[PDB]
Structure 1
Amino acid sequence: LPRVKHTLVPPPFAHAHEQVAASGPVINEFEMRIIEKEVQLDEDAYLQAMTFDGSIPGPLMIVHEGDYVELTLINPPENTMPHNIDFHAATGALGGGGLTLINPGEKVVLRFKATRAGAFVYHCAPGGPMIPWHVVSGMAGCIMVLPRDGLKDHEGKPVRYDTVYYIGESDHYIPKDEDGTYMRFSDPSEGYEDMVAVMDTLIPSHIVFNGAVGALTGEGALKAKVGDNVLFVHSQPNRDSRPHLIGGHGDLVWETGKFHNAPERDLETWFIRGGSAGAALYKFLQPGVYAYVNHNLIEAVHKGATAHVLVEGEWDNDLMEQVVAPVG
């Protein structure tokens, strides 16, 4: 088979690809380095992060149904623990976790057949309590396996996107000291027992897109223009989310994320099950600012689950118009 070496890019962007496969099955070669590091989630809050390739979420991989995926996974000697990878896209050996456990100073190569079309979570899952802990420390991403002939709507008709954005949502459990200030540690292990107590409450201290509060706002805002059909691929490896595009809709939504299932239409809010990725297409109709949020608004605003989309184009008063401006 032909082998294609890909260069991953940081989320929310995606490496170069084509929606409709240009070839018959290929072996897609990917490489990722595991990076443990403290990251700043908010002005007053830090996480002892464990990442694929230095980003939360890990980068998006895009392949086609029937392709193979060959991952070189490296755990550099400066990391402090073993890691592995479980692809929900894959069949067998706990998604690949049972064949990819590597100590710092080791690498491994896993191949699997992308037999099923859909956006899928991949995440670290080293065993026992390590499993949730690695995941809630940021060790999860997504692979999108597109049908070879691209996406189809509820009627089996072609649908093409102009832009794909990968929104990784992650819940985190940062402990606080007696003074109510978030705690900081030398490394992940020193913070573990304090983090476990917060985990056991099941209440996140933070719920973020692209690894930090406000990551996808300001300079990081998503960009589009009126007329663009945009695919929003949204992962949540540990906890449910309820995405909503404020001022928009889900034109075609695969909330369970698997492309051979008929999508729903016209959704106001959809549902991402913890442990999964979903996808929604919207064609922008109005210019302006949009917020993409988890529509538990406390999670959106207090916990950090808000992104912005900035949309260029011309306003359509037939869709919406302020007939009388605020007046006494």
Structure 2
Amino acid sequence: IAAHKGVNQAPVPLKMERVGPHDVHIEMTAQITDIEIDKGKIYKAWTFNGQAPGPLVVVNEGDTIHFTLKNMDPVVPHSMDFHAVHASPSKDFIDVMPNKSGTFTYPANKPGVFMYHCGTKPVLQHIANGMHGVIIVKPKNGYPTDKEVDREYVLIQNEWYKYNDMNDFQNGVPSYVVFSSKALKPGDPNTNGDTFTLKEKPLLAKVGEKIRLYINNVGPNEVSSFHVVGTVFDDVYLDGNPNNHLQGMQTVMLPASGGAVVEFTVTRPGTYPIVTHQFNHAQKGAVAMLKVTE
């Protein structure tokens, strides 16, 4: 795209504020940002807020979201689809033209770990070029294992293909498959989907802790066989709904767009890889590390 040549828009922080007991304002941008997806490889991503996956959004079950999208792309229209919400797609997930803004409103009345993404046609193009992320909706009455959890992180899986290559997006294998982590609390890491960051700067935990991961596989195209080496998931909630409650799973199957809450215990000091167990994807990037110390 000739209007993207040389464009590298600095990342902009997510803006969010609660405006009532059950109402929240969220304010994101669509923007064109260079991301290093593998060592030496820059992808001029289409993003929300200059991150891909986009910034983490967390709301409470029952919250109405009043969402604004500011489109900084000079030429391409963008939009937002949150999987958390009940909405009319053809009224509420519509395009925002270059250099304009749009505001849309809709309720999040289901707890869980939901994908969000651009919904502009062709959707595959928009998601593959980087316009994906996660919204977590916290359950009103929690999960039944809340009191057992010591520490929590967010992980997102995505793929990268040949740059803006529709034929590759539809017909090709991924070039890279990657994890990212998005921050829940001050001090947590906040990364982009790349092959290396969570290997070189592992997530951190303490011996004996029960870890919860909020996870989503945003695709665009692949399913994920999510596994943590050296442990067994004690509890799994499919899509993060507390009712969907599995126990003792070695590996969690995630459809494209699928989420889960998983919880496991790290019993001994050491570094614990986190993988998709489709090992062609692992090999192409999708390995994160959790370093567990005394």
Smaller-chain TM-score range?
0.7 to 0.9
Q: CA 1:106 to 1:228, structure 2 compared with 1: closer, same or farther past 3 Å?
A: farther
The size of the alignment, in residue pairs, is 267
CA–CA distance in 2 between the matches of 1:39 and 1:264?
A: 36
1:204-242, Cα deviation, whole Å (9 max, x unpaired)? 1111112111121212x1111123332212222222111
Shift in Å, 1:97: 7.4
Take 1:268 and 1:197, find their aligned partners in 2: how far apart are those partners? 35
Q: In the alignment, which residue of structure 2 is the partner of 1:136?
A: 128
Task: Tell me the equivalent position of 1:162.
Answer: 150
Aligned to 1:279: 261
State the SS of the aligned residue for 1:216. Answer: helix
RMSD, aligned CA:
2.4
CA deviation profile, 1:120-178 (whole Å, cap 9, x unmatched) = 10010102xx200110111111111111121125xxxx54533332211111211xxxx
User: Do the aligned partners of 1:100 and 1:109 also contact (CA within 8 Å) in 2?
Assistant: no
Q: C-alpha distance in 1, partners of 2:161/2:53?
A: 16
Give the TM-score normalised by the residue count of structure 1. Answer: 0.75
Q: Report the Cα offset of residue 70 of structure 1.
A: 2.1
Q: Deviation per CA, 1:85-129: give whole Å up to 9, x if none.
A: 1011111222x87444111211122221111111110010102xx
In the alignment, the residues of structure 1 paired with residue 104 and residue 152 of structure 2 have an alpha-carbon distance, to the nearest angstrom, of 26
Equivalent residue letter for 1:65: E
AA of the residue aligned to 2:215:
H
Which aligned pairs between 1:284-303 and structure 2 lie closer than 5 A? Answer: 284-301=266-283, 303=284
Amino acid at match of 1:276: G
Measured in 2, the distance between the counterparts of 1:135 and 1:97 equals 20
Instruction: Report the Cα distance in structure 2 between the residues aligned to 1:203 and 1:166, rounded to whole angstroms.
Output: 26
SS in 2 for 1:59: coil
CA distance in 1, matches of 2:127, 2:60: 26
Q: Give the aligned partner of residue 146 of structure 1.
A: 138
Consecutive unaligned residues in structure 1, runs of 5 or more: 1-6, 10-14, 18-23, 175-190, 314-328
Determine if the alignment matches structure 1 residue 113 to structure 2 residue 83.
Answer: no
| SS of structure 1 residue aligned to 2:254 | coil
Percent identity between the two aligned chains? 28
**Alpha carbons of 1:109 and 1:232: their partners in 2 closer, same or farther (altered >3 Å)?**
same
8 Å CA contact 1:252–1:282 kept in 2: the answer is yes
Deviations along 1:14-45, one digit per CA (max 9) or x if unpaired, are x999xxxxxx9421222212221232211353
Any conservation in 1 of the 2:227–2:250 contact (CA below 8 Å)? yes
Structure 2 equivalent of residue 86 of structure 1:
81
**How many angstroms apart in 2 are the aligned matches of 1:297 and 1:223?**
24
Determine helix, strand or coil for the equivalent of 2:123.
helix
- The residue correspondences of 1:89-100 to structure 2 (distance < 5 A) are 89-94=84-89, 98-100=92-94
TM-score (norm 2): 0.83
Structure with the larger strand share: 2
The answer as to whether partners of 2:142 and 2:242 remain within 8 angstroms in 1 is no
Residues 40-51 of structure 1 mapped to structure 2, 5 A cutoff: 40-51=36-47
Specify whether residues 228 and 107 from structure 1 end up closer, same or farther in structure 2 by C-alpha distance, changes over 3 A only. farther
Counterparts of 2:278 and 2:236, CA distance in 1: 19
Q: Equivalents in 2 of 1:79, 1:46: separation in Å?
A: 20
Q: Which residue of 284, 289, 292 maps to 1:308?
A: 289
2:246 maps to 264
Q: Which runs of 5+ in 2 are unaligned?
A: 1-12, 181-192
Describe the superposition over 1:251-298 as per-residue Cα deviations: whole angstroms up to 9, x where unpaired.
Answer: 1112x3132323211211111110222221123222210010111122
Task: Give the structure 2 partner of residue 125 of structure 1.
Answer: 119
**1:20 aligns to what?**
none
**1:266 maps to amino acid:** G
Secondary structure of residue in 2 paired with 1:203: coil
Q: Specify the alignment match of 2:235 in structure 1.
A: 252
1:217 match: secondary structure: helix
